[PDB]
Design a protein around this ligand. Structure first.
Ligand SMILES: CC1=C(/C=C/C(C)=C/C=C/C(C)=C/C=C/C=C(C)/C=C/C=C(C)/C=C/C2=C(C)C(=O)CCC2(C)C)C(C)(C)CCC1=O
Ligand SMILES: [Cl-]
Length: 314
């Protein structure tokens, strides 16, 4: 209950899917062309059983100029531009890309994948063979659960580009209006009646970020899977608005324990759906909350779990 960074250690039995950042680190070592080929390969194979939702209209508008610029290039330049993004080279295109929210980056690559499939953007060279390190990276990816697979792909996408500066422009999709109160569903969690946890889940499912933020302490933090804590209400609200629209949280069961100094620690396990895949991918998730004596959230971590065997009382 003292520091955010120490609270990271609550529920240390929870086995997170650290194969995800492991695999991203291996991927990040590869030659840029192999990075692009490997994701092409993974995207094509995954597409046989899983369809990516179309990017939103607003997103596509925001990425349109950059997409047009690539589409107007000769094939060798197209391939160079894509390599620049993978290498995190400092170029205008890479700086534009870095300014984008994850969804806009994903929609940019969704479009390029379609154009590559159609032959209008320089495809991976015909009969391309991956490097020794890259073939093994792809094999690991293809052995993972779908929820882990899509997280590897998102993390690879988000990592591309070049950030120069701390307070650079941030572009994101417009904020959706919260769901009308009448049509809202309420979660049920075995074992857990805690109103802060239930209101967390229900407000996020309603895209009601202004209500959700009011659950947190001023200094409180939210730790997304495999990322550092996001600290304080302004930064956490920013993250909700830019990155947390249209999720579906399906918490199943939890456990509630005392912590030092009148705090309460609560662990919930369940599933989450991203609007990119809807009901076709259910990620196995734990939430770990540390609530102060008044019930506000000092810390919440969201973990992608190593296997369904990590869900409580499988
Ligand atoms: C790149 C590339 C390509 C294309 C690639 C493409 C098109 C790839 C597309 C990949 C896509 C669309 C991946 C989407 C992933 C979404 C995830 C993991 C969301 C998780 C959300 C979670 C867990 C949120 C949970 C949450 C909960 C519960 C909270 O309680 C609090 C909020 C929080 C957010 C933490 C080509 C094919 C063109 C080849 C070349 C190439 O490189
Ligand atoms: Cl998402």
């Amino acid at each position: 209950p003292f520091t955010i960074d120490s609270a990271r250690g609550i529920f240390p039995n929870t086995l997170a899917a650290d194969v995800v950042p492991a695999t991203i680190a291996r991927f990040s070592q590869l030659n840029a062309e192999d990075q692009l080929a490997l994701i092409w390969f993974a995207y094509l194979e995954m597409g046989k059983t899983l369809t990516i939702a179309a990017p939103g209209a607003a997103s596509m508008q925001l990425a349109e100029n950059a997409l047009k610029e690539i589409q107007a290039m000769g094939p060798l330049q197209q391939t160079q531009a894509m390599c620049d993004l993978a290498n995190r080279a400092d170029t205008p295109l890479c700086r534009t890309y870095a300014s984008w929210s994850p969804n806009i980056k994903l929609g940019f690559w969704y479009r390029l994948g379609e154009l590559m499939e159609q032959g209008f953007v320089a495809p991976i060279p015909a009969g391309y063979q991956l490097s020794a390190n890259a073939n093994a990276v792809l094999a690991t990816i293809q052995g993972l659960e779908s929820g882990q697979q899509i997280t590897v792909l998102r993390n690879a996408v988000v990592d591309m580009g070049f950030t120069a500066g701390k307070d650079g422009k941030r572009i994101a999709e417009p904020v959706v209006p919260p769901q009308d109160t009448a049509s809202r569903t309420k979660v049920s969690i075995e074992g857990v009646t805690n109103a802060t946890v239930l209101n967390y889940m229900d407000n996020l499912n309603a895209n009601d970020f202004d209500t959700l933020i009011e659950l947190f302490t001023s200094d409180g933090a939210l730790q997304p899977p495999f990322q550092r804590p996001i600290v304080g209400k302004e930064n956490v609200l920013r993250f909700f608005r830019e990155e947390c629209q249209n999720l579906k949280l399906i918490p199943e069961r939890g456990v509630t324990e005392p912590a030092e100094d009148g705090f309460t620690q609560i662990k919930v396990t369940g599933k989450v759906q991203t609007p990119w895949f809807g009901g076709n991918v259910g990620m196995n998730i734990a939430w770990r909350f540390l609530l102060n004596p008044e019930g506000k959230i000092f810390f919440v971590a969201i973990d992608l779990l190593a296997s369904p065997k990590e869900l409580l009382n499988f």
